[PDB]
Each structure stands twice: as structure tokens, then as C-alpha cells.
């Protein structure tokens, strides 16, 4: 009925905000570019999604052999695990803020709690989606209010000139850069769209002029990604206007935002706590939906590469568990350190953006053969190659 959808994923949340607590308005440009890129990529897969009656996974299978198949399957599994780790940490932090339970108990609750999603499914969709949409929209209103006196030409002229010296030299910059990119693309979204397009009442083969569906779907996808771009830009400039030009250059993870909202002077006293807990709720809900979307993606991947299948609850459970193991390892090793956990989170995102090319290459290749093809694949070519140079340099400086 009414509009309801969740666009903020803790990955992009932390990455964008961090990018505004440390370096300022510099990263802004990168965001745009990444967003634009994803648009194009969506387009591509959707074309592949609608013709050739296959899924990107099946595609990969039809250009490989058994072993390298195992390899790319490992890679896709690792991408999914990365996203799930991001999510579970998001949920754990949300719980620790709202209630007070320590992190380990929250992590365990999250991992073996998927029964909530069968319960609430038996409960009713429209209401829950409406209410979460309301709360997210309101949280975003709050952030907008919170942004204050600012100098536009700064943001602008830093968006534009793209100080390459800057964007490449600070190897702290490449880090959050790759973070933003790999959190704006999210390969699991690629596989999932490739599959989901396969069902829109197009006359599967008996309409050579089904491309009307292509145009409609691409329009939808572009609208979606555009609004995601606006949200990311907002979060970044928020981190900027709330932590920049200061002493000790506090990192700017989640906790710091949660406090800065509370102790915020001009917001009175109680309103601090009000917005605080609202933010907490938002974090939690975003985590959960980001989980639920990717289960189908994992299923599709395994069905494609190994040509095997499992019921969903087993899939979700085992993935979540193998995801939560690194969380607990890091917690016990580093005895609990918000700084250390948020650093793990960002490293997860950047690892996602490292894995991307192994799933980007075959997409381009396959769209170079069949009946429908892009005229200027050259954009994707330059994209992947510049990409490879960046990732290998960031690897090298280690």
C-alpha cells in the first residue's frame, strides 16, 4: 500500500560517516563516481538478466571448469560472509546501546535468532514495513536538522577538483575510498538482480520486443540508486559538520555519533536521549533487513556454481554462524574495544570491494558475446583496470 523500503545499510553508514569525521569533504567526489558506476553495472546485468535465460552464476559455470568453479564459488561465499559480518556487528552495537547487555551476548542472540523473522512473517508485512519506513524517514529528518552553519563552496570545490595527490597519497584515504565503493556496489546485489529480473511477465522468448521490460526495470533501478546516492552524500557531510577541524580527530564510528547526538547542547537535554534511542532503533532495523535480502543471493550462488541446493533456514544459519566466528575471535582477542570492532567492520567492507573484480570480469565478458551488447563497453574496461591498479597498490603498501 504505502511506501516502505530500507536503504541505509550499516556498511555504507559507517563508511560514509567515517569519511566525514577524519578527512572532511575530500572523499565526497569518490562517492558520486562509485554510485554512477553501479548504475551502469545494474544496466548490464539486467540486460543479461532478461535474455539468455540464465543467471550470472550459471554464466560463470559455462565459461569454467570444476576447479576454477570451486575458486569463484569460494570468492562469492566470502563476499556474502563479509556482508553478513557487517550486519551482525551492526545489530550487536545497536543492542548494546539501547539496552546495556555486553557485546558477546548480543552477538550470540543475533546469530541464533532468525526465528523472529518467521514469527513476524506469520504476523504481518504491511504494518512492519510502514513503521520501519516511518522511523527511518524521521531519523533522516533529524540528521538534516542537525546540520548547521556551513560553507558551500568548500564542499563544492572539494567535490570537483578531486585532489589526486590527496586521493592517492594518504593510504588512509584509499582505505575509506575502497570502503565506500565496495559498500555502494555490493556484488550480492548483482547476483540477486540478475535472478530477480527473470520474472516480470515478459514473453520469455516469444517477444523479441520485450526490451520494454528492460527499459522499465532500468528506470526503476536508476531511481533506486540515485536516492541511495543522495543518502550517502548526506551521511558524509554529516560526519564532516559534526567532527571536523578539531583536536584528537576522533575517529567517528557509531558510538561517537550516538553520544554527540545526546550531549548536543542546542537540542536541549531530553531531546538528546530521544533522538539517541531513535537512532538506535534505526540501526537495528537496518541491520535486520540487510540480512534478510541476501539469503536468496547465497542460495542463487550455490545453486549456480555447485548445482546443488538446500532449504533456506539451514543456509542462513550456517552462513550466519561462520560469519559470527570472526566477531567473537576479535572480541576475545582485543578484550572489547569499540575502536577495534569498528575497524573490523570497515575492513570487512574493503575486503568486499577487493573481491568485486573476480565477479565483475565475467559479467563484461558475457555481455560481449550474445545478441544484445553495449556499444561502449569501454567504460567498464577502464573501470576494471583502474580498479585493479588501486586495489593492488593498497595491497602493496602493506
Amino acid at each position, epitope marked *: 500500500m504505502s511506501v516502505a523500503v530500507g536503504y541505509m545499510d550499516p556498511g555504507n553508514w559507517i563508511t560514509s560517516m567515517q569519511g566525514g569525521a577524519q578527512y572532511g569533504y575530500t572523499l565526497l567526489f569518490v562517492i558520486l563516481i562509485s554510485s554512477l558506476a553501479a548504475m551502469l553495472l545494474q544496466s548490464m546485468t539486467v540486460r543479461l538478466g532478461i535474455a539468455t535465460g540464465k543467471d550470472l552464476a550459471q554464466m560463470t559455470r559455462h565459461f569454467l571448469s570444476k576447479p576454477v568453479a570451486i575458486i569463484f564459488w569460494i570468492i562469492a561465499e566470502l563476499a556474502i560472509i563479509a556482508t553478513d559480518i557487517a550486519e551482525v556487528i551492526g545489530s550487536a552495537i545497536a543492542l548494546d546501546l539501547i539496552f546495556g547487555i555486553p557485546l558477546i551476548v548480543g552477538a550470540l542472540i543475533t546469530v541464533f535468532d532468525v526465528f523472529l523473522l518467521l514469527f513476524i512473517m506469520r504476523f504481518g508485512f504491511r504494518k512492519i514495513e510502514a513503521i520501519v519506513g516511518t522511523l527511518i524517514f524521521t531519523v533522516l529528518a533529524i540528521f538534516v536538522f542537525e546540520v548547521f552553519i556551513s560553507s558551500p563552496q568548500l564542499t563544492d570545490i572539494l567535490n570537483g577538483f578531486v585532489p589526486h595527490k590527496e586521493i592517492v597519497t594518504n593510504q588512509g584515504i584509499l582505505y575509506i575510498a575502497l570502503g565506500i565503493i565496495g559498500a555502494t556496489i555490493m556484488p550480492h546485489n548483482l547476483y540477486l538482480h540478475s535472478s530477480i529480473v527473470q520474472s516480470r511477465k515478459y514473453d520469455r522468448h516469444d517477444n523479441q520486443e520485450k526490451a520494454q521490460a528492460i527499459k522499465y526495470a532500468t528506470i526503476d533501478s536508476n531511481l533506486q540508486l540515485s536516492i541511495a546516492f543522495v543518502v550517502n552524500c548526506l551521511l558524509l557531510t554529516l560526519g564532516a559538520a559534526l567532527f571536523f577541524g578539531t583536536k584528537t580527530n576522533d575517529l567517528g564510528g557509531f558510538y*561517537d555519533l550516538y553520544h554527540a547526538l545526546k550531549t548536543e547542547p542546542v537540542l536541549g537535554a531530553t531531546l538528546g536521549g530521544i533522538m539517541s534511542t531513535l537512532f538506535a532503533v534505526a540501526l537495528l532495523a537496518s541491520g535486520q533487513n540487510s540480512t534478510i535480502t541476501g539469503t536468496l543471493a547465497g542460495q542463487i550462488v550455490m545453486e549456480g556454481f555447485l548445482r546443488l541446493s538446500i532449504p533456506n533456514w539451514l543456509r542462513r544459519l550456517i552462513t550466519r554462524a561462520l560469519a559470527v566466528i570472526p566477531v567473537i575471535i576479535c572480541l576475545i582477542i582485543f578484550k572489547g*574495544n*569499540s*575502536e577495534k570492532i569498528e575497524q573490523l567492520l570497515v575492513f570487512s567492507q574493503v575486503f568486499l570491494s577487493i573481491a568485486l573484480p573476480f565477479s565483475l570480469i565475467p559479467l563484461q565478458l558475457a555481455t560481449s558475446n550474445k545478441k544484445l551488447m553495449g556499444p561502449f563497453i569501454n567504460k567498464t574496461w577502464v573501470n576494471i583496470i583502474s580498479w585493479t591498479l588501486i586495489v593492488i597498490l593498497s595491497g602493496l603498501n602493506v
Partner: nanobody
Amino acid sequence: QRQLVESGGGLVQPGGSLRLSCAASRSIFSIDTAGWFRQAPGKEREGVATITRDGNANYADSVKGRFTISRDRARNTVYLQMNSLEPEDTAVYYCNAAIRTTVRTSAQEYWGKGTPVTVSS
């Protein structure tokens, strides 16, 4: 120097354990650097531990093995868990801090009032 409130001291047999908790009075943004001092009744204010901005947990040279400082970045509260206590650790345990009220105001010191801790049969 007020607006900090330690709490948790109490009688304890030799070899017991307990967790003192420096705190804040109202809605404090962050605790830069803590420190727990001791002022046993016939000596000078010694000093027992020191966390830093991120983490350093530097200790004294007579306590490593029993005292585990920590922080709680969620509800700003330094902790101090003493384990396997001894009859030579009786004293009042002050707390130091480096409170910073809001995200842009400079730092500012603060001392506590401290709490007693007795160890005996």
C-alpha cells in the same frame, strides 16, 4: 573537584575480588584518560593504573597480575577489577579523569572523592 562518583568499595576477605567503577555525573561525551590512585592511611597518593585515549592499560610494578583496568565506551565509565586481594591493598581508591563535555570544547581535569576498601578476616 566533584561531579565524579566512584562506587563499589566494601569489606572483602583476603583473596576476594571486586570491581570499582569511576563514573560521570550527567551525560558526558567522552573520557580521554583515566587513572586510579590509592592513598592508604600512612603513605602518599601512589597511583595504580592508567588507560589512555585508545588503550594502554599501563600498570604499576607491584600490581600486574591482579588489576585489570578497562573502559566502557557505551556508558562512559572506567572500570577497575581487582582480583585475589591482599591485606596490603587496603586504602581509599581515588579516580582521575580527563572529561570533555561536548564534541568541540577543550578537555578539562576532574578528581573524584574515592571509596574505601578493607581487606581482613
